[PDB]
Design a protein around this ligand. Structure first.
Ligand SMILES: [Mg+2]
Ligand SMILES: [Zn+2]
Lengths: 98, 147, 241, 46, 49, 74, 50
DNA sequence: GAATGTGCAACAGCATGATCGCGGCAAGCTGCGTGCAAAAGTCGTGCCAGC
RNA sequence: GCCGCGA
């Protein structure tokens, strides 16, 4: 499995798509000021190297597309996945807690 | 692991701080204790027969004068060993009772804060199971190598 | 002005010119043996126990007559410290003053912040009450208001209700009320660690890992959110032995 | 004035500003309040 | 389980390869290091039961 | 797939206990010895448990009585 | 004298971290031995000291 | 009318001053010596066993 | 550790 992942065959990409399907991943920007600076998202695989961020959440992130970078963390636990889906999702926090 | 110092040394943690534990526990100022800790002045202990006090801060010249006059009955050491001896010789309970008696007998806003701080530290020491002689250490622990 | 004042308000720093206040009955007395030390020693009889105050005469006195000056009235004009408001006007007044004053900074710059968040932090500044009575193993010391309230309730429940000791509530800054927590693992990870460790070492105290920072340092579930359910079940097991 | 010991009552604290419902037990309100107050300041004109 | 659990990391990796998604947490090595540093001074710190 | 979990929130209202209930149900359906009570749409066990909670046939009480029933059976 | 686990059993249940002064006896109890030489590693054998 | 403490103001020392990333250098190399027993290891030498 | 740089 390790060798065939290193070789990156097509079925490896298919299995990666299968795994990604509904596993939330949480993105955060560097100066996390309030709790809305780290939010969970459903990932969609893109053929590139830059994270594509939904514009409506940018005001929450204080993020603009002039060279900003963001970090990605995988909640690799069932409880962590539920917490990301039920507490961290962008659709969950619409009204700011201020 | 550990290393034996073969001579008591003073913990820099407690001696050098604005609310110095040993400093306000011995009712002596930080200048005098930091002064005896580097052998530049002597502290005599006991000496009830002689006129020397329990916490005298006599210097070297006074030490030779006492040796010429008092001779025996004068017990003074220069290093942290004297501090350890006078820390061990203290009776915590009777000192706390005397401090409480003085505090309730005489009321003064200036000495009240000092008396309350001293009695609080003494009560903490007696109730916590600690011993003041442990403040200055004779054996020094060392960190594990992999750290 | 500006906003190095949100820090100043939360630090509970006394201003350069405090405005002193009075007691229940501020009868006019002008001076009484003022002499060299200060001047205009006001001696309001107030029926009994007159409250002697000293004024350095560099500040004018506003209320010349008696006028039945009530407690908390401004005897001399000036910016009042939040400490005096707590002592004389009450717990609610110091929250109203802090909230209104800190909202002035935010509202001027067009920032919307709910009043609850400011009041929540003020609650954390209103601990460590001082006892002015005795009988219940408390006497002229700084003690947690939660502990004092719990002990009083137990004493009041029993027949000996007079054992309950009256207390005086204090107001501390955020930098000072943080270091005054009863747990040493926290408040040593925030400010001067040398000072906190020495006091914790001599006292022989315990942390008990009740807050968020302690459990984060150790790595257990924090007692909030999803971890609140786990921490509650553990507490019953300890209580039941 | 929650009068409760080691925490705040869910009624003395109003509805959480994130959602229309009342705040539920186990919500770390102190961190939220501190973050809410301290998120500005970077834009306060000193 | 992500940073400082020497056995927790391996247990998590084994569970994920198996497909369990179970936590099985432990004791971070950073706090043990901190305890060793504090004990290396004249201060005694310990964990009660 | 469930974009929002408001229905699960309103089925049993804490936004915190539902995480625990769904984690328990997902463990039951993932480690084995359990089958979903709602048609499986090739999605992961997390959203299957969440949809079971939302449709009202999974909660704390019935999970406990199921634990008791399978305990008494063996 | 086999089938023994120490890493797993090293995770013992605990609560209420306690801090106090360290007595010399307790310090010696922590210590597994005594260090007497300032040197650390000898270059003649690339091995630690005695 | 001279004497004795309490309040007090200037003063010296301690503690703190946002977060997360990226790329390059320059180092940082640390301390005997001693003569002898006592031991261990080594080298020149002779041995038997296999082809 | 310095030096420069990005939000
Ligand atoms: Mg930008
Ligand atoms: Zn309440």
């Amino acid at each position: 499995a390790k060798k065939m992942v290193e070789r990156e065959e097509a079925v490896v990409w298919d299995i990666l798509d299968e795994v990604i399907r509904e596993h939330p991943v949480l993105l955060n920007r560097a100066p996390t000021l309030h709790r809305l600076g780290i939010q969970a998202f459903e990932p969609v695989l893109i053929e590139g190297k830059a994270i594509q961020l939904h514009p409506l959440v940018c005001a929450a992130y204080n993020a603009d597309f002039d060279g900003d970078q963001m970090a990605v963390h995988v909640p690799l636990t069932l409880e962590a996945q539920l917490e990301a889906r039920a507490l961290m999702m962008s659709t969950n926090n619409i009204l700011s807690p201020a | 692991g550990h290393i034996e110092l073969a001579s008591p040394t003073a913990h820099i943690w407690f001696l050098k701080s604005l609310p110095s534990r040993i400093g306000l526990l011995l009712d002596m100022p930080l200048r005098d204790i930091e002064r005896v800790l580097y052998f530049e002045s002597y502290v005599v202990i006991e000496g009830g027969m002689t006129n020397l006090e329990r916490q005298q801060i006599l210097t070297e010249e006074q030490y030779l004068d006492a040796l010429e006059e008092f001779g025996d009955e004068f017990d003074a050491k220069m290093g942290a060993e004297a501090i350890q001896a006078l820390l061990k010789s203290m009776d915590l309970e009777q000192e706390c009772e005397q401090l409480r008696e003085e505090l309730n007998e005489t009321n003064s806003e200036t000495k009240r804060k000092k008396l309350t701080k001293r009695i609080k530290l003494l009560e903490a020491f007696v109730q916590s199971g600690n011993k003041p002689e442990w403040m200055i250490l004779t054996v020094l622990p060392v960190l594990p190598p992999d750290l | 002005g500006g906003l190095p004042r949100v820090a100043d308000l939360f630090e509970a720093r006394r201003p350069k010119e405090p405005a002193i206040l009075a007691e229940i009955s501020g009868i006019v007395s002008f001076g009484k043996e003022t002499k060299g030390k200060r001047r205009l020693v006001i001696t309001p009889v107030d029926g009994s126990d007159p409250y002697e105050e000293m004024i350095p005469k560099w500040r004018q006195l506003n209320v010349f007559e008696g006028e039945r000056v009530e407690r908390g009235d401004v005897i001399s004009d000036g910016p009042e410290a939040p400490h005096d408001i707590l002592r004389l006007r009450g717990v609610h007044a110091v929250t109203r003053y802090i909230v209104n004053e800190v909202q002035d900074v935010y509202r001027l710059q067009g920032v919307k912040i709910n009043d609850k968040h400011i009041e929540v932090i003020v609650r954390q500044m209103l601990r460590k009450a001082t006892i002015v009575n005795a009988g219940s193993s408390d006497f002229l010391e700084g003690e947690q208001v939660e502990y004092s309230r719990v002990k009083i309730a137990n004493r009041e429940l029993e027949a000996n209700g007079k054992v309950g000791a009256t207390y005086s509530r204090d107001l501390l800054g955020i930098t000072k009320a943080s270091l005054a927590t009863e747990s040493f693992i926290s408040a040593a990870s925030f400010q001067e660690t040398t000072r906190v460790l020495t006091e914790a070492a001599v006292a022989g105290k315990r942390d008990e890992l009740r807050g968020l920072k302690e459990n984060v340092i150790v790595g257990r579930l924090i007692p909030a959110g999803t971890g609140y359910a786990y921490h509650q079940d553990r507490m019953r097991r300890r209580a039941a032995g | 004035s929650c009068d409760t010991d080691f925490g705040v009552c869910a009624h003395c604290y109003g509805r959480d500003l994130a959602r229309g419902h009342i705040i539920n037990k186990g919500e770390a309100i102190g961190v939220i309040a501190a973050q809410s107050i301290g998120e500005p300041g970077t834009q306060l004109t000193m | 389980v992500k940073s400082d659990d020497v056995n927790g990391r391996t247990k998590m990796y084994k569970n994920i390869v198996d497909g369990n998604h179970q936590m099985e947490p432990g004791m971070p090595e950073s706090f043990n290091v901190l305890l060793k540093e504090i004990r290396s001074l004249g201060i005694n710190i310990e964990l009660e039961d | 797939a469930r974009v929002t979990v408001q229905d699960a929130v309103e089925k049993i209202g804490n936004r915190f206990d539902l995480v625990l209930v769904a984690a328990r149900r997902a463990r039951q359906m993932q480690v084995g010895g359990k089958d979903p009570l709602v048609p499986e749409e090739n999605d992961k066990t997390t959203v299957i448990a969440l949809r079971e909670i939302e449709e009202g046939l999974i909660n704390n009480q019935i999970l406990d009585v199921r634990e008791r029933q399978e305990q008494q059976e063996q | 004298l086999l089938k023994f686990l120490k890493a797993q059993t090293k995770t013992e249940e605990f609560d209420a971290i306690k801090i106090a002064l360290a007595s010399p006896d307790m310090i010696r109890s922590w210590s597994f031995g005594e260090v007497k030489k300032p040197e650390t590693i000898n270059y003649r054998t690339f091995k630690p000291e005695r």
